[PDB]
Amino acid sequence: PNLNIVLTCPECKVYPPKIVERFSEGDVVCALCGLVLSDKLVDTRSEWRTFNPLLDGNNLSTRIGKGETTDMRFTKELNKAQGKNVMDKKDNEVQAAFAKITMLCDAAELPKIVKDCAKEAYKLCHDEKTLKGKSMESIMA
Amino acid sequence: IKWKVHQVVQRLKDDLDKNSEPNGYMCPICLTKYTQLEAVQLLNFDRTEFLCSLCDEPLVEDDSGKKNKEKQDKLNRLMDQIQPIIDSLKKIDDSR
Amino acid sequence: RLKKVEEEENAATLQLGQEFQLKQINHQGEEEELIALNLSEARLVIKEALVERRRAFKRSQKKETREKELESIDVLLEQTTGGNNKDLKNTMQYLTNFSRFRDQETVGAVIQLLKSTGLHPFEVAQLGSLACDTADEAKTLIPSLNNKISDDELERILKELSNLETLY
Amino acid sequence: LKEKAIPKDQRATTPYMTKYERARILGTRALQISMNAPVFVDLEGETDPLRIAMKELAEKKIPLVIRRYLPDGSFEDWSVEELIVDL
Amino acid sequence: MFFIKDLSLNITLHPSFFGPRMKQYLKTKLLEEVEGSCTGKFGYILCVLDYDNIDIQRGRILPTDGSAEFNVKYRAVVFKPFKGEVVDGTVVSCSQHGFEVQVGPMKVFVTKHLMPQDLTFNAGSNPPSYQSSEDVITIKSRIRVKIEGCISQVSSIHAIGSIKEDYLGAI
Ligand SMILES: [Zn+2]
């Protein structure tokens, strides 16, 4: 399929064309000819103005609990049901290691960068026959 | 068992009827199925290769037309195997 | 409406089309039956409208010879429309090559017979479209001809239809 | 079904062309002047399409007809000539 | 096949063409978009019948554009494809997996598995022809073909054909 869209002025063709973007109107124009190519651009900053996935992996983490317009009788069922799928993933052990290295780094008052780099270091291997257990704390240390 | 054997007979018969017809064509880039009548309009300007709408790539014929005899042989051998079961079903229909 | 399946195989044995019903209604509110036209009479009637519209365009700027016709209506059609209707030239060539009667009055006398006989319209339109002379090989070719109509009556109308038509 | 129309006699609508279709017919004549469909009233040098439409309506040679509806679905027909631009 | 039916068709027109002589202009329009047209519902549309006393009688201006539309009820001659009818069509182009017969509007093609095996196919022919006694693709190329189904699709219409029948194929 080649999954490709290439933009080229249909009247200049000098190269992959020397084109510019007018974000204030959201349009694109070949600067040589002065003709539009396409319109109605999508913003690239308003989403960052609107609102650790690499360490949590492709599967996505979800903590669950209680609210205002709910009932305690079933939010306690939810609190005892939140562990009914932690055994499906090894991410429960990944996040246990993440929690424990968080314990350690903030215990030694280490910053966010140190915490995330230790998260990276565990996520790097996280499983080999070279790892082989070894008290499960030697690896985080 | 009756619904199972009837579904086996009808599914294998329709599969054999489809597989007795020739293949169609295969595009190795997009990895999708195509038929001969769909490929009728996929001829290029010069009738040389079968042009692809997306990949602009030639279409090559699949290997299932010789699976016609294979599906026929599987149907016949399976029918021979289940022929004691067919006879037992006949005797059941004789009985109550 | 509920996908409107209505699965019908199309055949000459009164296995009709999904849109080409026998009974419709017309724009005037009166009942419009089905109209089918044979090859010979179609080739005859198209020339009426052809010469009518040719003299109509001639009056607009003011305000049977098939060898003539294949080039003549080609000139007329390339005058008003483009040269893309080589397909139409092929269809009128089919209309004029394998039509059972070249002339008009034999077909007209056949129609004058059929308006008194009151045969089945689609059946006799198929018979007029096809070009054969003997009923039994017509029957063996078409199972609709095998089953719909008795061979003796088919033959006794086939000879008085085939005596008029110009043999090829 | 039953031709869904009425003859031009015994029409029971008002004979006074009112504001909304006045606006519509002015706008349409603006469109024909917009894409240079031929004018009927003579020019006096003005180029405003709305002015052209206003003058054409005032001299009453607009070549359009108007259709009204009723809650049943049947419709009436009128020409702008037989209406009288009164307000 | 070649049939007659009442047809109603709607057409539109650009507002710059509001001259006095537009009825005949509409007639000419009707000729060019009626002629040379193949539809899925009624096959190929050949030409028009009853040129005089045509009925248009009213048009509506679009509210947003000056264009006005006009519905035209008319008689016409059309070709309607069907399944299982022996016709004596002609062949123009041929392929090694099968000849392509041009029966009127269609290009009916017979795939390599539908030619009878008792037909004495020779590969060394230009064009490749399937002849046994007299069914040779020629300048006439009249071959008795039966369209057992015309496969109308998105509008590149093709018909399937067969000559696996006695006297079918041969002439
Ligand atoms: Zn440019």
Curated annotation (Swiss-Prot), chain A:
<feature type="binding site">
    <location>
        <position position="12"/>
    </location>
    <ligand>
        <name>Zn(2+)</name>
    </ligand>
</feature>
<feature type="zinc finger region" description="TFIIB-type">
    <location>
        <begin position="5"/>
        <end position="38"/>
    </location>
</feature>
<protein>
    <recommendedName>
        <fullName>Transcription initiation factor IIB</fullName>
    </recommendedName>
</protein>
<feature type="binding site">
    <location>
        <position position="33"/>
    </location>
    <ligand>
        <name>Zn(2+)</name>
    </ligand>
</feature>
<feature type="binding site">
    <location>
        <position position="30"/>
    </location>
    <ligand>
        <name>Zn(2+)</name>
    </ligand>
</feature>
<comment type="similarity">
    <text>Belongs to the TFIIB family.</text>
</comment>
<feature type="binding site">
    <location>
        <position position="9"/>
    </location>
    <ligand>
        <name>Zn(2+)</name>
    </ligand>
</feature>
<comment type="function">
    <text>General factor that plays a major role in the activation of eukaryotic genes transcribed by RNA polymerase II.</text>
</comment>
<comment type="subunit">
    <text>Associates with TFIID-IIA (DA complex) to form TFIID-IIA-IIB (DAB-complex) which is then recognized by polymerase II.</text>
</comment>
Curated annotation (Swiss-Prot), chain D:
<dbReference type="GO" id="GO:0042797">
    <property type="term" value="P:tRNA transcription by RNA polymerase III"/>
</dbReference>
<dbReference type="GO" id="GO:0003899">
    <property type="term" value="F:DNA-directed RNA polymerase activity"/>
</dbReference>
<dbReference type="GO" id="GO:0006383">
    <property type="term" value="P:transcription by RNA polymerase III"/>
</dbReference>
<keyword id="KW-0240">DNA-directed RNA polymerase</keyword>
<dbReference type="GO" id="GO:0006361">
    <property type="term" value="P:transcription initiation at RNA polymerase I promoter"/>
</dbReference>
<dbReference type="GO" id="GO:0006363">
    <property type="term" value="P:termination of RNA polymerase I transcription"/>
</dbReference>
<keyword id="KW-0804">Transcription</keyword>
<comment type="subunit">
    <text>Component of the RNA polymerase I (Pol I), RNA polymerase II (Pol II) and RNA polymerase III (Pol III) complexes. Component of the RNA polymerase I (Pol I) complex consisting of 14 subunits: RPA135, RPA190, RPC40, RPA14, RPB5, RPO26, RPA43, RPB8, RPA12, RPB10, RPC19, RPC10, RPA49 and RPA34. The complex is composed of a horseshoe-shaped core containing ten subunits (RPA135, RPA190, RPB5, RPO26, RPB8, RPB10, RPC10, RPA12, RPC19 and RPC40) where RPA135 and RPA190 form the DNA-binding cleft.</text>
</comment>
<keyword id="KW-0597">Phosphoprotein</keyword>
<keyword id="KW-0690">Ribosome biogenesis</keyword>
<dbReference type="GO" id="GO:0006366">
    <property type="term" value="P:transcription by RNA polymerase II"/>
</dbReference>
<dbReference type="GO" id="GO:0001172">
    <property type="term" value="P:RNA-templated transcription"/>
</dbReference>
<dbReference type="GO" id="GO:0005654">
    <property type="term" value="C:nucleoplasm"/>
</dbReference>
<dbReference type="GO" id="GO:0006360">
    <property type="term" value="P:transcription by RNA polymerase I"/>
</dbReference>
<dbReference type="GO" id="GO:0042254">
    <property type="term" value="P:ribosome biogenesis"/>
</dbReference>
<protein>
    <recommendedName>
        <fullName>DNA-directed RNA polymerases I, II, and III subunit RPABC2</fullName>
    </recommendedName>
</protein>
<dbReference type="GO" id="GO:0006367">
    <property type="term" value="P:transcription initiation at RNA polymerase II promoter"/>
</dbReference>
<feature type="region of interest" description="Leucine-zipper">
    <location>
        <begin position="43"/>
        <end position="64"/>
    </location>
</feature>
<dbReference type="GO" id="GO:0006368">
    <property type="term" value="P:transcription elongation by RNA polymerase II"/>
</dbReference>
<keyword id="KW-0963">Cytoplasm</keyword>
<dbReference type="GO" id="GO:0042790">
    <property type="term" value="P:nucleolar large rRNA transcription by RNA polymerase I"/>
</dbReference>
<comment type="function">
    <text>DNA-dependent RNA polymerases catalyze the transcription of DNA into RNA using the four ribonucleoside triphosphates as substrates. Common component of RNA polymerases I, II and III which synthesize ribosomal RNA precursors, mRNA precursors and many functional non-coding RNAs, and small RNAs, such as 5S rRNA and tRNAs, respectively. Pol II is the central component of the basal RNA polymerase II transcription machinery. RNA polymerases are composed of mobile elements that move relative to each other.</text>
</comment>
